[PDB]
Symmetry: D2
Subunit: 240 residues, 4 copies
């Protein structure tokens, strides 16, 4: 079984992606922010995956995790960079930390993990790098300058890497979710959530499985001629 690495697989979009790639036939290593989180992933995946703890802000941990996968399971041939943490603020309340942490978790992590898996994909002459971006990289809102800059940077990074790796048949793409229902949108008010769905042409929030379906498509042999693109999964919230 080819190995897929899905960061942030504990819940929501990351969990749905990891479960779908298992259904597709991959051996899935999912990462969590803690050891207890990783054990819960290990329990859930059984025979067909493994859970590992990973702080994606940490280069040493990134390297230790990929080395561990290589030693125990095989080369990482599908990499899904999945982060959703936000630190929103209007610009003159947006601190240095709020800026730096979001750029590090989202964009620097994509640079570091993509770099680290290139060797094994190159040797296999097969690879899928699939980056979770956001509608926000294209549909501007106040208070999200750091998240928006990080996600747009990810999409541009992906285009340049797609050009570098294309001749060896490795594809590099992004999936850009719109408003996806999560445990915290469940926590929002009824009214705030309606204000969200009224902007969506399909008139509803999406589900984590919608994003997992798009990632599964790109990771499969049905998408072997797609590289350097953004796959928008937002119900018509943003159309391009």
């Amino acid at each position: 079984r080819k190995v897929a690495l899905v960061t942030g697989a504990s819940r929501g979009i990351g969990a749905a992606i990891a479960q779908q790639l298992i259904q597709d036939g991959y051996f899935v290593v999912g990462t969590a922010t803690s050891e207890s989180g990783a054990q819960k992933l290990t329990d859930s995946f059984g025979e067909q995956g493994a859970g590992l703890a990973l702080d994606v802000r940490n280069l040493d941990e990134i390297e230790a995790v990929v080395s561990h996968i290589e030693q125990n399971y095989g080369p990482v041939l599908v990499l899904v960079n999945n982060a959703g943490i936000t630190k929103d603020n209007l610009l003159l309340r947006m601190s240095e930390d709020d800026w730096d942490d979001i750029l590090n978790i989202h964009l620097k992590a994509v640079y570091r993990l993509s770099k680290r898996v290139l060797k094994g994909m190159t040797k296999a002459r097969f690879g899928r790098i699939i980056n979770i971006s956001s509608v926000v990289a294209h549909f501007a809102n106040p208070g999200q300058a750091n998240y928006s800059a990080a996600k747009a940077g990810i999409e541009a990074f992906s285009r340049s890497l797609a050009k570098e790796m294309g001749s060896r048949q490795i594809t590099v793409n992004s999936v850009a979710p719109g408003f996806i229902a999560t445990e915290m949108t469940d926590a929002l008010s009824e009214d705030i959530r309606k204000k969200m769905s009224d902007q969506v042409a399909l008139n509803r929030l999406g589900e984590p499985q919608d994003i997992a379906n798009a990632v599964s498509f790109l990771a499969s042999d049905k998408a072997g001629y797609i590289t350097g693109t953004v796959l928008h999964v937002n119900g018509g919230l943003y159309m391009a």
Copy 2:
């Protein structure tokens, strides 16, 4: 008869044929259209139990209405519509005639307007629908001599966004698939050298295949793409990245 009905225009060969065969594999009853009766019979022969062939000149409103009415009477409402046209009439602007302009805009863009309009009722009633328009990399990646084809394909993509907004509340999705350089009977006929200059522009360093486009259409037509609408799915091997 009891499967959902898909209508694929221009299904005789290449991308259209691959789309029609893939949607049959997916479980749709596929009506494919050809430019002549003998072409339609060959589609009928190929599809058997799981589709039908009909002759259709997509420049003709009367034929568009007769074909969809025939499908409604004999098979069911059109719930997946794939608008597929590939004819070109390239020329630098100084040599591009009124006919060269009008015919390309009519075959590509007007046909999308007419056929989309005609299937809206049945999709609305079913509260399910997929309209999938075959666009082109050329709507975004400019090159000389294609002003009519490029304008038509870009118009299709903008049309699709408008219609996606109109139909979204009824869960009908409207999307485009934009092929890059796809190998066809006609690129097979080109020289070795001309075809190399094509693939050297592609990041994956090869021409695509009709099945690559069929795979993308199949994805969008499925329940795996129910939250995707108003988008362009680029299938060009990195020839154009957006």
Copy 3:
């Protein structure tokens, strides 16, 4: 004194463009839909322009008008294709004539007039084709499928023609207005117009002079290295 042709120059954006290009030093031929309209343009422009009647749906009139300009004033070296007529309708209610007329007035006219001025620009080693597009070619809303398709077609047409004419230093660009105040938006309600400006980051409708400023920039020697682009003038209604 170089000749500029501005279609639909009677009022609004077209009038502001024509007056600005006169200030810039061009001899401006403006067109109107009737002879009395053309005479009003002639009166307004005086020494520095002329008014002509032109139905842009008519190839014979397009040819007669450009030939008349060539015979009496000089080659058309700046062409501004300006049309604003709409025939909005949900697709259900959008007739063949509503579709055909909008595509003919907006997109076919750009094809016909651009084709007709190429010779003189080619011979002069200088040219500006500036097409008035719209935010609507990019920012989708229901009921405008014909207008949106026509404007997007214009932008794609312009890219192809920019590639064809670039070696001879002729530039081909589009200007895409957002919500611009007109006699027609003056007539709307107070509430409807507020519902427009609240979507604009600058929190106001634009003015015809804003579009004239953008056209003037592109028509000048300050924009000689800009071709095949869309210049968005929408106050942040749409950002790309």
Copy 4:
């Protein structure tokens, strides 16, 4: 006079921008990487500007420079963020420092300087933030993942900030140069430079003045209804 701050004004695009804004009537503070560089700027600008040394990687220096301008000349009402340094490499050879330094010089500097000038623009009910991006944020090439990600991040940052500041009539835009002739491209071979111009529809490299013209347009009252956009100045190298 209103004060404009142009970073990296010693040569090339930055120098042309600074000289053009002086011609437009601004008092221009230009920055250089050293004190001797700043003195040269002071000598060149005379009565109509000043030179200051600034390492844009340094928050303390950014704060000291803007405070110095506020104390001696007036509020910064036009900010031009101009950086061109590259640290290209295929991803396996792209070090942590190559990534971090480019993201800091280009994108973090835009965040820090934009944040620092917001107060004075807000108080004046007038402002222009103009960020020098690049064609590379859109036209992917191998070996530039860091530069491309930084420039795309700048464009997304600008859209978010344009939404935030729009009601106060402050505009935030980017100018994206293509292949512009520099001291650097003068040094390239004849053949390599031809490889560049053959990709340009206008069949030539641009000049620093072409970028200065675009910045001058956006900084003027001729562009008061343009915000959150990218102005592409690339001769048709990339068309959108």
